From Swiss-Prot:
Range covered out of full length: 200 to 756 of 756
Reactions this protein catalyses: a 1,2-diacyl-sn-glycero-3-phospho-(1D-myo-inositol-4,5-bisphosphate) + H2O = 1D-myo-inositol 1,4,5-trisphosphate + a 1,2-diacyl-sn-glycerol + H(+); a 1,2-diacyl-sn-glycero-3-phospho-(1D-myo-inositol) + H2O = 1D-myo-inositol 1-phosphate + a 1,2-diacyl-sn-glycerol + H(+)
Protein name per UniProt: 1-phosphatidylinositol 4,5-bisphosphate phosphodiesterase delta-1
Biological process annotations from GO: angiogenesis; cellular response to calcium ion; G protein-coupled receptor signaling pathway; labyrinthine layer blood vessel development; lipid catabolic process; phosphatidylinositol metabolic process; phospholipase C-activating G protein-coupled receptor signaling pathway; phospholipase C/protein kinase C signal transduction
Keyword Hydrolase: yes
Record note on what altering S279A does: Lowers activity 10000-fold
Lineage of source species: Eukaryota, Metazoa, Chordata, Craniata, Vertebrata
Listed cofactors: Ca(2+)
Residues that coordinate or bind substrate: K239, K241, S279, R306
Domain annotation PI-PLC X-box: ranges: 97-241
Annotated phenotype, changing R306A: Lowers activity 600-fold
Active-site residues, as the UniProt record annotates them: H112, H157
Mutation effect (W312A): Lowers activity very slightly
Length: 513
């Protein structure tokens, strides 16, 4: 029993099976057999002895098998539960993309009314709100500045009862955390309602506090395009109105001149300058995407566009970012403080490219001569249908969503495809009753995805309730090109984006053209 029970608890058939298939009759996987697994099952492109051997050196527990270039079932499991066994590509968990193009070519992690911790009407504001966001990799922040007592500018939500904070205190927090998560440029959106004098104060604080991090002069030779993330590495840049407004501030706006949306031109008239940025509410954006989908896309190739949540979302709720990304919208601002599927998708996207906060758009979204319109799909390089098969096998140590600490979870799994409208889909498994430790579903879903470059696959686990809304247990969102094949574990995250140390899903993924 102290083995029976013990090791029976700690025992997974699906794993046994997998090893068996891999290893066949042997009690061990030889480097050769492992390589075959890595290739045939895991579809690793760098599949080979070098890979195999590192996996064994890295994960094999038996000194004998290790020394002898072999993997036991235990090392097999370790591997599968490791960062290498993660359904989210380990290789993409480091900056690996081209960081030398104009900013407008990247999707940028952006926050809305960053200072807020809760609702838009009366909740608190705090420097913490800025620290958190920056710690989640956010690059684009928002400061709503108003005149404050003692000639000290404050920040809060204009015309509301939201609590207040100091512009200067905010600046220090930003300075301290701007690059804790990424070395790439941070952009500060200043919504300026300050008197001339206090505007002067702001400028003083900016210079004093940010010091040399602040970008206050154009980049040398940057003439026809926005600089690249690499060129602006380690810098903070301001976005706002440029010449009611003191020069001290206006002179600091370099590549992000706040501008009213004109329309989409083409030549050197109308469709704004690269160093100028327009903003669109959630609604206007949709309509524009609705009527002038390709115009927007094309507009977005050389220009940065900021989207922000509809005014009615006083609860700080969030819209779906995907719909904006499909149009090439880069600065899609969300309420970082609000847990939900929207932020789940948001942070899944930005976990890519080493989580640096700048994720390179697909090529077709970087072609000024683009005929793409996610809303009216025609043939083009973006069209590359794939057949995805996901098998939800089992779950391991699913957290109790909390509740009257006595009931046991009755887990079910939902799998969703987010992307161009035609690709969006969702499927769910059955509910296993009373088992969060090791529910087993062994259910498979298949999805057809025509524009994978814009897709994301999301796994969600709920605790089923007949009497009410199901409790969210954990989640994980993976960008299409980071989705690893074969047998893998999906490491579940909490509402708040936190990693759940031992809560996982064991799955088998296969992608075929
Ligand atoms: Ba604002
Ligand atoms: Ba129960
Ligand atoms: Ba329940």
């Amino acid at each position: 029993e102290i083995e029976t029970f013990y090791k029976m608890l700690t025992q997974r058939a699906e794993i046994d099976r997998a090893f068996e298939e891999a290893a066949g009759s042997a009690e061990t996987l030889s480097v050769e057999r492992l390589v075959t697994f890595l290739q045939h099952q895991q579809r690793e492109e760098e599949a080979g002895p070098a890979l195999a051997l590192s996996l064994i050196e890295r994960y094999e527990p038996s000194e004998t098998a290790k020394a002898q270039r072999q993997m036991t079932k235990d090392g097999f499991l370790m591997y599968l539960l490791s960062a290498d066994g993660n359904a989210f590509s380990l290789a993409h968990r480091r900056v690996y993309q081209d960081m030398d193009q104009p900013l407008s070519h990247y999707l940028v992690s952006s926050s809305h009314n960053t200072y807020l911790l809760e609702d838009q009407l009366t909740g608190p504001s705090s420097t913490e709100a800025y620290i958190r966001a920056l710690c989640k990799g956010c690059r684009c922040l928002e400061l709503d500045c108003w005149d404050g007592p003692n000639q000290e500018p404050i920040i809060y939500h204009g015309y509301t009862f939201t609590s207040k904070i100091l512009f200067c205190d905010v600046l220090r927090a930003i300075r301290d955390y701007a690059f804790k998560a990424s070395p790439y440029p941070v952009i500060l959106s200043l919504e300026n309602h300050c008197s001339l004098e206090q505007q002067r104060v702001m400028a003083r604080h900016l210079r004093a506090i940010l010091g040399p991090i602040l970008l206050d002069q154009p980049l040398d030779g940057v003439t026809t395009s926005l600089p690249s993330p690499e060129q602006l590495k380690g810098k903070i840049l301001l976005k706002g109105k440029k010449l009611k407004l003191v020069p001290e501030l206006s002179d600091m706006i370099i590549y992000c001149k706040s501008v009213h949306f004109g329309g989409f031109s083409s030549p050197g008239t109308s469709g704004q300058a690269f160093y100028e940025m327009a903003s669109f509410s959630e609604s206007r954006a949709l309509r524009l995407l609705q009527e002038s989908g390709n115009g927007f896309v094309r507009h977005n190739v050389s220009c940065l566009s900021r989207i922000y949540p509809a005014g009615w979302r006083t609860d700080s709720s969030n819209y779906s970012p995907v719909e904006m990304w499909n149009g090439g919208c880069q600065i899609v601002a969300l309420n970082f403080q609000t847990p939900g599927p929207e932020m789940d998708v948001y942070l899944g996207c930005f976990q890519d490219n080493g989580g640096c906060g700048y994720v390179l758009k697909p090529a077709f979204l970087r072609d000024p001569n683009t005929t793409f319109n996610s809303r009216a799909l025609t043939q083009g390089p973006w069209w590359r249908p794939e057949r995805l098969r996901v098998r939800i096998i089992s779950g391991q140590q699913l957290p109790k969503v909390n509740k009257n600490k006595n009931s046991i979870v009755d887990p079910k799994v939902i799998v969703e495809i987010h992307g161009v409208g035609r690709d969006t889909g969702s499927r769910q498994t059955a509910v296993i009753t009373n088992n969060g430790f090791n529910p087993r579903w062994d259910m498979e879903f298949e999805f057809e995805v025509t524009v994978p470059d814009l897709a994301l696959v999301r796994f969600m686990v709920e605790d089923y309730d007949s009497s009410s809304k199901n409790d969210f247990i954990g989640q994980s969102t993976i960008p299409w090109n980071s989705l690893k094949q074969g047998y893998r574990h999906v490491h579940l995250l909490s509402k708040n984006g936190d990693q759940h140390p031992s809560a996982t899903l064991f799955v088998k993924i296969s992608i075929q053209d």
